[PDB]
């Protein structure tokens, strides 16, 4: 539990400094997109105005927003060292868990003669994957409006975030309401923290839970909606497929997991 | 021996309420 | 115990058999 | 028969009162056995610094020769038709009873009266009873929980006469020669503050004229005019902390300034003192005693033994625990005990009121079975409530007290008092005092 | 969970900590309003409401 | 009727495959360790080695051969009294807290 | 004389972390990108700090 | 308002008295213990007495100990080298909870594995802290090096079955030795009514009498070992009688007449004749006490003494020396009749509590079967006559003798002199 | 059950560091110092922060 919800404020650190970052080459995207994102606050009762004006340090998106965004894209990475520095000292304390999710206490080996080189091995893949869009595709998930002066006088033919941001800003799209929009985006990533109490099963790890499997390739697969409709404009019919598929999430994580899990033990006599 | 140990007189570092050895101190240990 | 005096150890010579006894709440005795 | 019918029975405790002071009570019943004693108000309380410790060396010298029982002839009638004779001097009474047979009871008077008033005090023997107290003072300091609470005595009632040991100080006991004796014998050995108690088959008329037809010389004159007079105690939060650490374990007593002999928040305390309840390594409950401290200290082995004591003088007495534990563990209970304290000033609720309502009960009827504890009962309480409180009115107090005034009553003592604590052995892990103070009190309170 | 916590002794705790809890409320209020300077309620209260 | 599902379910599960009765699978909390440790000496060596031998076969990704699986009908459920015994004890703790 | 690597403070932190910890034997690929993210985070780091040398 | 001592076909003897006390108190009295232990078994007896309070068939551990503490009762499991004495108390208006847990406890144990096998360690704990004082040691050794057997064994666990005592020794000891016939139950301020319909509803369950014992045989030992304590505790007992008989009387008698027991606190103890026989000569700290112990098949009497490392040889001898001169007709009639006067003052002063009531109930339902008056009992000890008295001592003298020593052993005397 | 700052991992490193670390008991106020340049860090860095967002 410690470290699950250390992991979530990791990622909930790291999406708040990609989105910041983004800002800093002041393309049109960037610029736009930022108005966008930070007047999504203004959906905020009371307060929620005043807070726009804050964070922009000012009437919008101006040099002031630019330059706080770049110190403290500049701060938070050594943040987000501290809190997996915790993070790896809560995993520590209880130890890893194996893909069958029994205690492999009877079966462990050390970490540097093996647990190493097979990470080097990882990372050289990742350095491989990484390497193959710098240096052959480098604007590939990039948009090419960035490529561009941001002129406040001319709203761009679509904004949209990156990539790892379209399915929380596609939930975002689906609910009518704004202030319940950004309610949605944001429990979109919280509902992590509810995780270990939604879980049922007397099957800690999913190895030997076909069902459960098959819920979660859905909520993969609804996901890669997301993101998919995220990128496309607010139109027929990508309206009623992203609003489908927002529903779907939440369904599948706070009912079809639990329920499947209850049908689970009922099915292995426990 | 252990008889023979006791505490040394703290009158010098005491506050004034309880300097007295007669009265108690649940009166004044409210004011202090 | 220390029993450096007669008077003291007045008592300590037993004269009955041994009953063990212990409680649930109560310290465990011998006599 | 029910609980109450039984408490009412209870065989009454008839007090009179001879023209010299000398208020006989007794408590007939059945048994062919009694227990007939003197419980005299005299004590290391009324000693002052230069005598010291007389108190104990006249219950040393009171059994060895009494003029008209030439000596150890009194010890002879004494074994002769088997009666034990015993005295216990405590920091504020003291008594000289002797457990005998009912038939005896003529007798028994008489060696009473021949012990609390016409005793030889020979020089001899106080030569040769100065040794035996130095010894019993080397056992006593051998003794790892008596001076732990002689300790704890010495620093809270520091300054005042409480605080004075009851053997005295290694000191006194080689300078006590008989004129200091026989002053503090005729200057508290006096009728007035004597109460003649005995239980079992003992009639009260009977009782009335034996001591009529032998304590009758008993006078409460006071020479010229000195009179001794009751020094109220001031409650001093300290901490002594004698660290020896090649001692096995480690003692640790904390109390806090609690009510007196005749309040009735005794009742609820003693009640809150059940809830903590006691423990010892060889108990058998170990991780399933409803005791929350008990239950968590038997968990991971944390101590060897805690108790919680309600000492209790005249105008004041002490409230608290003492544990023996290893060295480290005398931080956790630090933590663990107050914390109990803290939640019993806390929140309390009327299943563990119930509880130690229960255990109080339990203790009360099962401390005053024998003749013995019955004759102590009376001596005891007639010399501080005025009066042998019926356990009928202890059942009452006790219904009467509930989750409220237990709350209320250890919010006024416990809550963010100044503790007095006082340790022995290797007292190291023992918390700072300005820790123990901090933890008197919680930030969410 | 739902059932272990739903007891008399429970209940019990409940109603002994209500007002220290209750009113541990009250100082957060008091400290929000105060920290953020609330126009709405310092308005009301006097002595204060001259700083406007 | 649904013991043919529970059979298919059983098959389909996996744990069949490595060699490990049901207890073998179950997540480890509180009340699990206390059954573990209340077990016996011959069922908690079993079932460690079972655990290991399960553990080395998906570190090599090597399900165990077809023959010697556990079988619907041979799978007995060993920690099932121990576990049913501490939550009972856990349950009447609880209820007397209440 | 006692080892360098789990007598001094720090080596024995990074011992007990990632030399001699117990790491159960069958950990698939899922687990790597842990250590992946760490150094995808390094990676950054290091080239955010030559980015803000010029921006 | 008196003592019904109902027995029962089964063999199970009900026993109670209406005292209309506040507070009531029930015992089962089991003719287990030590003595009944095998030379396999051996600690059996002390982890039952260690076993009160793990989970019976209808009662679990946590309930037993929330129960009884809530009620406010204790329960102790007091033994002796041949008896078992289960006893809960509490007030009078729920005797029945508590009465119907300690009936599980007795006549209804599971002895779970984990749960004795935690229990284990408590062995060890409860063995030292008894064996913290010298007298358990010295005593324990008397009745290895007295008999070859039976009594022979110890209260507490060897130190090689401490860890080993499995729960199918504890399940053949209840079911060899808590059968129906060899128990008895005593109640103070509970009805006979209930008691029997709780006697008959639970404990009928165990019928029959169980595997009997065995006798024990004097063996004339001499165990010693050097402790290092400074005061020497030594012990020489030769086999005086059984109990229940005019020798056990005279026997009692005998002891008071040497002495046993400082009546007046921090006294000289004149009438002893030990203690002033063995004052004159050694002038350091000693204590010099006749020791009896009236098991039921066979019994013990000589001299417990606590002396100096040093002055041990003397102390030993002078005191034996003067029970030679009592064996001798130096026995005067005034000395007999303080010794009776003693003996009937302890009978009536054990008895005078409510728990020493109880505990004299028991053993005169287990041994004897027929309860006597305490009046009966004083009858019997004036019975008693001076040619007795005199064995008696023949006997003690005469008979050979067991020998215990611990400490400094540098200057104890052996039994050969 | 047991104590959180004893207990907790976070918490036992902030217990043994700060709170219940034993330091000798006459350290005069030169020591003082040591802190201080901590807090001087914090204070210090916190405004130099600030001047980031408008530089
Ligand atoms: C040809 C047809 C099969 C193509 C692959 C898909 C498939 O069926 O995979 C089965 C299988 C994965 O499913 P599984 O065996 O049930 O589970 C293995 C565990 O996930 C543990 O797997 P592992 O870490 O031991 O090795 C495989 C893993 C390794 O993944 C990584 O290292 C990360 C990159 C992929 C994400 O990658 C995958 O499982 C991804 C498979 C699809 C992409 C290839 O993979 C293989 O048999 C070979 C994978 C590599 C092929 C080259
Ligand atoms: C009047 C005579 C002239 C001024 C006193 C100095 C002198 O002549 O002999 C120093 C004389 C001899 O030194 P010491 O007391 O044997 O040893 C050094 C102290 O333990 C070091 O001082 P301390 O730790 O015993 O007590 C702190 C002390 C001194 O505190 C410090 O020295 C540290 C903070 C200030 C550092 C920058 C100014 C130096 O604070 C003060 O004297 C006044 C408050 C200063 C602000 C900090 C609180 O000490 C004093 O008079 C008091 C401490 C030094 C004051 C400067
Ligand atoms: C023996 O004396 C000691 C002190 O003071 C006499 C201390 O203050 C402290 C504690 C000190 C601090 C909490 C702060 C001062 C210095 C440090 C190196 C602590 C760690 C660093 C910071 C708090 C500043 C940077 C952290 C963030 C931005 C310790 C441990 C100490 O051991
Ligand atoms: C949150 C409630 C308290 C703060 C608030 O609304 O106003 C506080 C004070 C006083 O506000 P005020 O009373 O002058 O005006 C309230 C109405 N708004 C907020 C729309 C201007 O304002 C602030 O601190 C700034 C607003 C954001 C606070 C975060
Ligand atoms: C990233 C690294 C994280 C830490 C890895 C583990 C610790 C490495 C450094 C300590 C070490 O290995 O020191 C070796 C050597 C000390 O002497 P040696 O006899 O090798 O070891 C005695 C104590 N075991 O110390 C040396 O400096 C080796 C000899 C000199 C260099 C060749
Ligand atoms: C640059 C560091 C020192 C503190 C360590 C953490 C201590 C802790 O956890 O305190 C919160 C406390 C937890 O419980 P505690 O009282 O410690 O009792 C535990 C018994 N096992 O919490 C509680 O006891 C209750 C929960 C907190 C209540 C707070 C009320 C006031 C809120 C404002
Ligand atoms: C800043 C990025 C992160 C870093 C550097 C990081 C670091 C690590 C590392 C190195 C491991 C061990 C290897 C592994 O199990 O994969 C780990 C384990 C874990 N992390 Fe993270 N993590 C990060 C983000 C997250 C996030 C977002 C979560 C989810 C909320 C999370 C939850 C976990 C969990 C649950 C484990 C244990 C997995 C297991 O034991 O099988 N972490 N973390
Ligand atoms: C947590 C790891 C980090 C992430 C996820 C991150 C993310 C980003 C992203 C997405 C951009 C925009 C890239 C683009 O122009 O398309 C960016 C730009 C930038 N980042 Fe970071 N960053 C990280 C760490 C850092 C650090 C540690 C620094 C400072 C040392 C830094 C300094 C910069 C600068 C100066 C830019 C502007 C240059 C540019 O946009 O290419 N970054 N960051
Ligand atoms: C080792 C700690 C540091 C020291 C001693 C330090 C010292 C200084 C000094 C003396 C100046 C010049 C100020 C002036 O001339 O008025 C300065 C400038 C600056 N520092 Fe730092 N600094 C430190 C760390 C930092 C950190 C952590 C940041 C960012 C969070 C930062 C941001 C700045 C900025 C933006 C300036 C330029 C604005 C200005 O001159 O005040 N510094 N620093």
Redesign the interface.
Same mark, same amino acid.
């Given at each position: 539990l410690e470290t699950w919800n250390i992991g979530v404020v990791l990622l909930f650190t790291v999406m708040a400094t990609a989105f910041m970052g983004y800002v800093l080459p002041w393309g049109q995207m960037s610029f736009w997109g930022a108005t966008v994102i930070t007047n999504l606050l203004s959906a905020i009762p009371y307060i929620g105005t005043d807070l726009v004006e804050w964070i922009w340090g000012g009437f919008s998106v101006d040099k002031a927003t630019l330059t706080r965004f770049f110190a403290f894209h500049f701060i938070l990475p050594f943040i987000i060292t501290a809190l997996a520095a915790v993070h790896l000292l809560f995993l520590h304390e209880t130890g890893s868990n194996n893909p069958t999710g029994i205690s492999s206490d009877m079966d462990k080996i050390p970490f540097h003669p093996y647990y190493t080189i097979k990470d080097i091995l990882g990372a050289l893949f990742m350095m491989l994957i990484l390497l193959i869009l710098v240096l052959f595709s480098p604007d590939l998930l990039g948009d090419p409006d960035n490529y561009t002066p941001a002129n406040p006088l001319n709203t761009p033919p679509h904004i949209k975030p990156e990539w790892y941001f379209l399915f929380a800003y596609a939930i975002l799209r689906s609910i009518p309401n704004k202030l319940g929009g950004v309610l949605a985006l944001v429990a979109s990533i919280l509902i992590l923290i509810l995780m270990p109490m939604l879980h049922t099963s007397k099957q800690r790890s999913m190895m030997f839970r076909p069902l459960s499997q098959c819920l979660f390739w859905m909520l993969v697969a609804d996901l890669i909606t997301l993101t998919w409709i995220g990128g496309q404009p607010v139109e027929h019919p990508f309206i009623i497929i992203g609003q489908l598929a927002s529903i779907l999430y939440f369904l599948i994580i706070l009912v079809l997991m639990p329920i499947t899990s209850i049908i689970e033990n009922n099915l292995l006599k426990w | 021996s252990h008889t023979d140990i006791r505490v040394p007189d703290f009158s010098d570092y005491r506050r004034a309420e309880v300097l007295d050895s007669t009265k108690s101190s649940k009166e004044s240990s409210d004011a202090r | 115990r220390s029993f450096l005096c007669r008077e003291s150890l007045s008592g300590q010579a037993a004269g009955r058999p041994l009953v063990a006894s212990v409680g649930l709440n109560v310290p465990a005795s011998v006599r | =028969?029910?609980?109450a019918?039984?408490?009412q029975?209870?065989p009454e405790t008839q007090v009179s009162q001879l023209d010299n002071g000398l208020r006989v009570a007794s408590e007939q019943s059945s048994?062919?056995?009694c227990t007939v004693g003197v419980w005299i108000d005299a004590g290391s309380r009324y000693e002052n610094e230069k005598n010291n410790?007389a108190g104990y060396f006249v219950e040393?010298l009171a059994?060895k020769g009494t003029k008209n029982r030439p000596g /150890?002839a009194?010890? +002879?009638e004494?074994? #002769?038709?088997? =009666?034990?004779?015993? =005295?216990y001097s405590t920091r504020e009474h003291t008594a000289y009873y002797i +457990?005998?047979?009912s038939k005896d009871l003529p007798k028994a008077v008489e060696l009473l009266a021949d012990i609390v008033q016409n005793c030889s005090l020979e020089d001899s023997q106080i030569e040769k009873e100065r040794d035996?107290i130095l010894?019993?003072?080397?056992?006593?300091? /051998?003794?790892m929980r &008596?001076?732990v609470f &002689?300790?704890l005595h010495?620093?809270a009632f520091?300054?005042?006469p409480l =605080?004075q040991?009851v053997?005295?100080? #290694?000191?006194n006991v080689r300078k006590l020669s008989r004129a200091d004796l026989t002053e503090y014998v005729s200057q508290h050995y006096k009728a007035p503050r004597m109460v003649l108690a005995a239980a079992?088959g003992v009639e009260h008329r009977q009782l009335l004229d034996l001591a009529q037809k032998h304590f009758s010389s008993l006078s409460g004159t006071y020479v010229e005019d000195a009179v001794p007079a009751f020094?109220?105690?001031?409650?001093?939060? /300290?901490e002594?902390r004698?660290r020896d650490d090649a001692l096995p374990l480690a003692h640790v007593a904390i109390a806090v300034?609690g009510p007196g002999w005749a309040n009735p928040d005794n009742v609820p305390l003693q009640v809150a003192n059940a809830i903590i *309840?006691?423990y010892?390594?060889?108990?058998? *409950?170990?991780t399933?005693?409803? $005791?929350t401290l008990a239950s968590?200290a038997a968990?991971?082995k944390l101590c060897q $033994?805690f108790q919680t004591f309600n000492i209790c003088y005249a105008?004041?007495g002490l409230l608290g625990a003492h544990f023996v534990c290893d060295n480290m563990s005398i931080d &956790?209970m630090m933590?663990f005990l107050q914390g109990q304290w803290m939640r019993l000033c806390? $929140?309390?609720?009327?299943?563990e009121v119930?509880?130690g309502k229960?255990?109080l009960?339990?203790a009360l009827?099962?401390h005053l &079975?024998?003749?013995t504890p019955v004759c102590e009962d009376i001596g005891r309480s007639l010399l501080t409530y005025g009066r042998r409180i019926p356990?009928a009115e202890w059942e009452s107090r006790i219904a009467e007290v509930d989750?409220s005034v237990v709350?209320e009553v250890c919010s006024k003592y416990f809550y963010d008092?100044?503790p007095a604590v006082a340790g022995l052995g290797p007292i190291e892990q023992l918390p700072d005092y300005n820790r123990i103070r901090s933890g008197m009190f919680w930030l969410?309170? | 969970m739902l059932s272990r916590f739903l007891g008399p002794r429970y209940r019990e705790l409940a109603r002994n900590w209500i007002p220290t809890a209750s009113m541990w409320g009250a100082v957060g209020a008091v400290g929000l309003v105060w920290a953020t300077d609330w126009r709405l309620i310092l308005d009301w209260v006097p002595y204060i409401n001259g700083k406007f | 009727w649904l013991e043919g599902i529970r059979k298919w379910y059983y098959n389909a599960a996996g744990f069949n495959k490595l060699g490990l009765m049901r207890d073998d699978t179950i997540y480890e909390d509180d009340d699990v360790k206390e059954a573990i440790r209340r077990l016996p000496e011959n069922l908690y060596n079993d079932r460690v080695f079972r655990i290991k031998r399960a553990l080395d076969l998906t570190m090599r990704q090597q399900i165990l051969p077809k023959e010697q699986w556990t079988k619907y009908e041979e799978d007995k459920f060993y920690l099932e009294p121990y576990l049913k015994e501490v939550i009972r004890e856990r349950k009447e703790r609880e209820e007397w807290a209440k | 004389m006692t080892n360098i690597r789990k007598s001094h403070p720090l080596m024995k932190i990074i011992n007990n972390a990632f030399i001699d910890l117990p790491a159960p034997s069958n950990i698939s690929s899922w687990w790597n990108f842990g250590s992946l993210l760490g150094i995808c985070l390094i990676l950054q780091i290091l080239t955010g700090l030559f980015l803000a040398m010029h921006y | 308002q008196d003592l019904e001592f109902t027995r029962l076909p089964n063999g199970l003897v009900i026993a109670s008295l209406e005292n209309y006390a506040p507070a009531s108190r029930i015992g089962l009295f089991i003719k287990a213990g030590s003595r009944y232990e095998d030379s396999n078994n051996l600690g059996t007896s002390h982890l039952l007495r260690l076993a009160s309070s793990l989970t019976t068939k209808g009662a679990s551990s946590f309930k037993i100990t929330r129960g009884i503490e809530a009620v406010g009762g204790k329960l102790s499991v007091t033994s002796t080298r041949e008896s078992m004495a289960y006893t809960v108390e509490c007030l009078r208006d729920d005797i029945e909870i508590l009465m119907e847990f300690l009936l599980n406890v007795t006549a209804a144990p599971e002895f779970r594995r984990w749960e004795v096998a935690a229990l284990q360690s408590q062995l060890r704990i409860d063995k030292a802290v008894a064996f913290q004082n010298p007298q358990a040691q010295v005593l324990e050794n008397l009745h290895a090096a007295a008999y070859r057997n039976a009594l022979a064994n110890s209260l507490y666990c060897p130190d090689y079955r401490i860890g080993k005592v499995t729960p199918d020794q504890l399940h053949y000891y209840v079911q060899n030795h808590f059968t129906s016939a060899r128990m008895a139950l005593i109640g103070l301020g509970v009805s006979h009514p209930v008691l029997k319909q709780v006697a008959e509803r639970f404990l009928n369950m165990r019928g029959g009498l169980g595997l009997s014992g065995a006798k024990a045989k004097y063996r004339g030992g001499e165990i010693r070992d050097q402790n290092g304590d400074s005061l020497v505790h030594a012990a020489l007992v030769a086999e005086s009688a059984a109990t229940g008989s005019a020798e056990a009387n005279a026997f009692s008698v005998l002891q008071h007449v040497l002495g046993a027991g400082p009546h007046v606190k921090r006294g000289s103890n004149a009438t002893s004749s030990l203690y002033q026989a063995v004052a004159k000569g050694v002038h350091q700290p000693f204590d010099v006490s006749a020791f009896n112990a009236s098991y039921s098949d066979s019994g013990l009497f000589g001299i417990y003494t606590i002396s100096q490392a040093a002055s041990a040889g003397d102390v030993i001898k002078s005191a034996y020396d003067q029970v030679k001169t009592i064996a001798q007709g130096n026995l005067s009639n005034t000395d007999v009749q303080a010794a009776k006067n003693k003996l009937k003052a302890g009978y009536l002063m054990s008895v005078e509590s409510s728990e020493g009531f109880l505990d004299e109930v028991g053993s005169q339902a287990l041994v004897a079967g027929s309860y006597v008056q305490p009046s009966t009992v004083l009858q019997q000890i004036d019975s008693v006559a001076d040619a007795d008295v005199i064995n008696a001592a023949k006997k003690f003298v005469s008979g050979r003798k067991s020998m215990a020593a611990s400490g400094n052993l540098g200057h104890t005397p052996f039994v050969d002199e």
């Open positions: - | - | - | =028969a029910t609980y019918q039984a408490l029975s209870v048994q062919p056995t410790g040393h059994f /150890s009194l010890e +002879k004494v074994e #002769s038709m088997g =009666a034990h004779l015993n =005295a +457990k005998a047979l035996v010894q019993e003072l080397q056992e006593n300091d /051998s003794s &008596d001076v &002689d300790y010495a620093t520091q300054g005042t =605080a040991s053997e005295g100080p #290694s000191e079992g020094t109220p105690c001031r409650f001093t939060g /300290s002594i004698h300034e *309840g006691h010892d390594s060889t108990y058998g *409950g170990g399933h005693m409803s $005791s968590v968990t991971r $033994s105008e004041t &956790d933590f806390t $929140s309390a609720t009327e299943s119930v509880r229960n255990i009960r339990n009827v099962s &079975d024998g003749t356990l989750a709350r008092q100044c969410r309170f | - | - | - | -």
